[PDB]
């Protein structure tokens, strides 16, 4: 049988964070720790929430110590701030980095033997649900509000590790494009292609089945339709991206991903490469590698990305799907090669061994060898 | 903004009930009350679950008093059994009637001021979540496992009332076609067109938006593709129907339905008409009534039901969608007329007023008058 974990409650649309104070009052929670980053405080995005909480008389404290590719240090520090705050629930405001940090804090707070953080890697055998989490994404996006995953960086071991735990699922998600509009174009582009990567990898993952296929192909259609418009600053395209990125995530932790995420994680660990940029550069090269192991699915991908697939052979349609992703990457300004973003050619064997051992790689529809992953890094590294 | 309430955890596929014992152990629950009906005991469907619970050493008691179109009396009886069982959680085994009874028991147990049951109608002002519910559907189906609704019959007032409450959402749903295979063909057919009705009414409902449109149009495609095979006893078609009926429910309480459910409820209240059969007979007639107020959506319905809509006018595509539903009803043996299931012509004005006031009717894309609903009942009743 196939398991689906989803948010029991989610609010969608501009103004969705307007539902938060009523959700808190109905659940009887007394005090939030807001888990976020310094940028979202400074840009006034956190105030969009705390102004409503103040008006409603709801107490909060803040941890804004999250940094991109959050580390064991960031988690332990946040846990300390949570313990001292007296908070009884968590509000995650931000992209994947604050949402994942918030998941780690909420899990460890109710499962304190996991305070080393490393021991959470894999299918975390936690006895207790997380401290309740209300999740508010500000990127479009990681879908961290709806997955059972969180990704922590072990700086000492120079690796990203994935923690997979039904106990971390947020109680309520608020998917509000008002919270996302401040993303600079380059961040809309990067997080948008991360969302497309979730949807494409989830569509073709080894565990794919009818329900996740339906969700993923819809998310591909929405994201391919909206991303150029959103990067260009269109408000309605931004709301479409907010939905598309969430739908993309409804499959991620339920069926899995593949070698794009597998190969992106080591770049984040080695260089602190933004997750979305790493995925975007790798995506079309890994799609080419996987093409002949995906049955009819690249014809579907090409079709919903606006390719006229009628009369194409399956091999032509597969090529067309890859070219449609190359074209989207060029149009939204993703750097074309890994060498552009400071990846070192001599690190490729170490990156390739890290990618081969990454949990995401196991979902890849083609069984990757060390040599295959080395060649893929080389293909993505330079013209 | 649009709210979606869904199951936090759901298991899908043949053998999904195999996940139940590990779910109970993980949540630390001590003793189940199983809420079900006598048919499911007799046919050995309940034993498919209790044998697994017995094997895993999990304690259970049973209330098997549920009847179709469950009454206030059935809710109070089941509540008494729950109170005296020492159970700390609920397992709903059955179609909409057991799943709705189970929601009522679970809500009233943690909100004991609603023991009169009538006080739950509408947006139930409950303060506490239901006793935790693990939902196992045996029809395909009402999708009661994933909605926040439950429908109770007030025998004294001869009416069905809808209770709407986020507090009633089951914690886990187990959607297992092994639990559904034993439905008689006529019940597969009726519950299957009820599922199609949820998907079609949900697709065209006034509150429809992008996410529910995507889910509903997929559910229509799955159900239209699978229902003939499932009724005929095809194993894979049965598994497809188990998924399609669930997806068809992901909008029932999230966006709403319309006049098919609005007109079906009074038939249940007046005659004890099976919910599925009532909806199946009404569906194509109400679709015809609604057609010109549904934008492009019947072209989408016609397309996923196998109609070649290329070069069709919008009205040709609408007529083809309606014809495809009439054809499916004939093809799985739904009775053609309300007269065939004992609906009385002289009751139509009373049925029409009840339908006009039904909560479901508010979602209908065409604004229905009493006179419109009287005429629709006549169209669905007549052998002409
Ligand atoms: N299943 C999961 O939980 C999951 C899935 C995908 C990725 N991830 C993880 O998520 C992380 C990446 O998250 P991300 O891509 O959302 O970025 P992020 O959270 O790392 O943020 C990137 C930068 O964008 C800024 N930013 C975010 N929202 C902004 C806004 N609205 N306006 C202005 N600036 C804004 C942040 O302050 C930060 O400087 C990685 O660690 C990745 O591994 C986890
Ligand atoms: N959102 C909701 O909660 C929701 C949605 C739609 C309908 N409903 C309600 O659900 C009820 C109808 O439920 P239903 O259509 O599933 O039917 P049901 O539960 O009323 O059952 C109908 C008959 O089928 C039998 N049966 C069920 N499963 C069987 C199986 N596997 N094998 C053999 N016999 C089986 C039952 O014993 C009964 O005799 C109505 O009261 C309706 O209002 C509620
Ligand atoms: Fe990602
Ligand atoms: Fe129904």
Swiss-Prot record, chain A:
It comes from the Bacteria. Homodimer. The gene is fucO. One of its GO terms (molecular function) is R-lactaldehyde reductase activity. This is Lactaldehyde reductase. It comes from Escherichia coli O157:H7. NAD(+) binds at residues 37, 69, 96-97, 138-142, 149, 160, 179-183. It catalyses: (R)-propane-1,2-diol + NAD(+) = (R)-lactaldehyde + NADH + H(+); (S)-propane-1,2-diol + NAD(+) = (S)-lactaldehyde + NADH + H(+). The keyword Disulfide bond does not apply. Fe cation binds at residues 194, 198, 261, 275. PROSITE patterns: ADH_IRON_1, ADH_IRON_2. Transmembrane segments: none annotated. Belongs to the iron-containing alcohol dehydrogenase family. Its cofactor is Fe cation.
């Amino acid at each position: 049988a196939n398991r689906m974990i989803l948010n029991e409650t989610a609010w969608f649309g501009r103004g969705a964070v307007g539902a938060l104070t009523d959700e808190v009052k109905r659940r009887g929670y007394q005090k939030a720790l807001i888990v976020t980053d310094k940028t979202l405080v400074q840009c006034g995005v956190v105030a969009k929430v705390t102004d409503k909480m103040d008006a409603a008389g709801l107490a909060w404290a803040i941890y804004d110590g999250v940094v991109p590719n959050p580390t064991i240090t960031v988690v332990k520090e946040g846990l300390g701030v949570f313990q001292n705050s007296g908070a009884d629930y968590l509000i995650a405001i931000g992209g994947g980095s604050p949402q994942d940090t918030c998941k780690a804090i909420g899990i460890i707070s109710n499962n304190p033997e996991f305070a080393d953080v490393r021991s959470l890697e894999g299918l975390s055998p936690t006895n207790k649900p997380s401290v309740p989490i209300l999740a508010i994404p500000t990127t479009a996006g990681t879908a961290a509000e709806v997955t059972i995953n969180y990704v922590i960086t072990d700086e000492e071991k120079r690796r990203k590790f994935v923690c997979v735990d039904p106990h971390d699922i947020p109680q309520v998600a608020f998917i509000d494009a008002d919270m996302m509009d401040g993303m600079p174009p380059a961040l809309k582009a990067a997080t948008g292609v991360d969302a497309l990567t979730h949807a494409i990898e989830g569509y073709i993952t080894r565990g794919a089945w009818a329900l996740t296929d339906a969700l993923h192909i819809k998310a591909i259609e929405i994201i391919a339709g909206a991303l150029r418009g959103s990067v260009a600053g269109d408000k309605d395209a931004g709301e479409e991206m907010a939905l598309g990125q969430y739908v993309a995530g409804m499959g991620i932790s339920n069926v899995g991903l593949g070698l794009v995420h597998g190969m992106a994680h080591p770049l984040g660990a080695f260089y602190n490469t933004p997750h979305g940029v790493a995925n975007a550069i790798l995506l079309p090269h890994v799609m080419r590698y996987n093409a002949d192991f995906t049955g009819e699915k690249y014809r579907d991908i090409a079709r919903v990305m606006g390719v006229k697939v009628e009369g194409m052979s399956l091999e032509e349609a597969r090529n067309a799907a890859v070219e449609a992703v190359f074209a989207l990457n060029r149009d939204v300004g993703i750097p074309p090669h890994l060498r552009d973003v400071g990846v070192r050619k001599e690190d490729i064997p170490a990156l390739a061994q890290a990618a081969l051992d990454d949990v995401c790689t196991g979902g890849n529809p083609r069984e990757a060898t060390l040599e295959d992953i080395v060649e893929l890094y080389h293909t993505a590294w330079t013209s």
